[PDB]
Nucleic acid binder design. Sequence first.
RNA 1: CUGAAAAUACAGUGGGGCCACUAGGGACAGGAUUGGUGACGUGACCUGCCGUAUAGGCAG
Lengths: 100, 50, 307, 197
Amino acid sequence: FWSADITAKIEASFCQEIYPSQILNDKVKQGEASKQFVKAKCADGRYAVSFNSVKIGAALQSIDDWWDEDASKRLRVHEFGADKEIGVARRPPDSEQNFY
Amino acid sequence: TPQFSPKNISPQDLTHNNILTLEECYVPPNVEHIFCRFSLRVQANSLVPS
Amino acid sequence: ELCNILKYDRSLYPGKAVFFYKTADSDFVPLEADINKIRNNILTLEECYVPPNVEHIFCRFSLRVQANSLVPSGCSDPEVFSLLKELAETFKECGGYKELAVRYCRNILIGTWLWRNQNTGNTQIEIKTSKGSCYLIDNTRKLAWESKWASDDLKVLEELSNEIESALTDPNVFWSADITAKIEASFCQEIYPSQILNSKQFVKAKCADGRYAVSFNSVKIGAALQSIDDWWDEDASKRLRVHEFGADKEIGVARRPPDSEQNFYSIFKNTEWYLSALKNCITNNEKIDPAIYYLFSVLIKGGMFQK
Amino acid sequence: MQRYYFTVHFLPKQANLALLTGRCISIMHGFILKHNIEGMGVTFPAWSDSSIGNEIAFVYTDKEILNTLKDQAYFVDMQDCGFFKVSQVLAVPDSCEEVRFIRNQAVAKIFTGESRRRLKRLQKRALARGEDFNPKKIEAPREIDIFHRVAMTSKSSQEDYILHIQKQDVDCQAEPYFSNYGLASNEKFKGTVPDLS
RNA sequence: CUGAAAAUACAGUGGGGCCACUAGGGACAGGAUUGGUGACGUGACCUGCCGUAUAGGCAG
């Protein structure tokens, strides 16, 4: 039974902008804000701005650079090796490199 | 237009704005350090299919 | 020609610009607005002025600079990605980022970013960089874009432009600067921070102790630094905030309209043309085409442009 | 004893009410100073929480002097042009329905210029007395009830300013004692006017 | 200038009595929303007085 407590301490600039996880709003009413942030509600009642667990999970599993012998870029571990920057699958179903 | 031709709507409406209602997170003034903490558990689930 | 998912991340990251004053006991007293409410459908009228015994007021913000204008953040087309990469490299090696950096730097030194509070008193500007430099302007009120400066202010401009240009071109260099303006306030001088759109309320920054200090939006300081676009015509009356259609907010009509060939997208369709023009501009006293300066100023602004 | 009145109704929909209300009160003020009249009151029949109305009414005990005030140049001129609807001198229904319109000066403290003026004076006075000038700020935000603006020009000093008018409701009629704008200033003057609709 | 003219459906009224839905129970595995943004300067809220007073009252 193994568990780790991991803490980052960032020397912040004066009123520096923080970039947490954003909640989706395609269904938008113009009363309340469209672009929101993912929040962890504390016991006191206040809301701490936070990342999703899957967001953290996606970062740790950014290890896949086996899709070419000279590829330096690491993809998030996917069954088809999807690269959403350049917008192609690096392990297509046509090839022998996809998981299945 | 979809094939790059300018459609004719008012010259004054191009400099016109959109109202955006956003949430913003900034560090409070004269706070030197910010902290981000998560916990990681590791289980041996890749040996046998569930 | 143009891609599906072409997008750029901005290069200049300014913070919120907080207003404050220094007493004998404390060296950060936040400047608070006076809230008045009326009537329950309560209206809130807020007014902001310098407290009676305070003789200097301070506007402070941090500017950090990444090199996010060399390669696009996302792209579908590999040939476009390779083209833009080589274009950026060509523009860098020619030394146009220096000219952009100087214009960005000059706006910091003349106190543009102090919008309606600019030259209301004898403003001095202190700039402390991450590399342990410390620049001082002494009097903001004696400078201007078209004015010729003293050698001291030109040395400050040269050195800080070199630091910003190095930060804009090198991906392996992390660069930040802390910029404070000290303004000689008159007796209860009215101060003009940023307002909320929705009554009259001011953009506040909540301190650690709970008190709210009036400030400028980061976007507004940004809009000040990136007010360099005078390439739209030869005798340009003003410098526009860098926009893809050259939109002027005060007058309220575009100076680079979609019908014209001087809007961003018309210039972005001739990249392979401008690359050959830049490659000819290498080794050559020949000046760079202003369309490429406007192009790279939009790429330093960033965007999730077409489409 | 029987208080007579007339009413000036502003017909155009695009009319700036603070301007026209000021003009009507200034002409009344001028007339009062010229003829040496005491007890003249102003009432707003069409007073809402949204705004002051299109109607302003002048309440006094004498009928002839109200008829004299109805026959001023500006009123007949703006009635000829067709912007004004000026009523005849009618006796008040005299049943009940007393209100009090006050010029509340304290409203003027919500603006920066007033604080600057007030502190400059306090500084001079504190300096004159010989102590150190150190004023202390308030903790609670200033609470004011709904007020309406009447734009007023000092012809003596050529200075534009504003009357902050607030409506209060009273039970029964008090003595007719008002300011030179007929506007019962909430301590010095306690003059009530009949509520019209 | 009509498949033509004309036309009072009415009075009275007891649905009642009786009643057991029960037993048993795994929704489960995986997941990057992301790029970019100037609320105001054709505006009334001014200038003074009294007061120890950013209290509170006043003149145009």
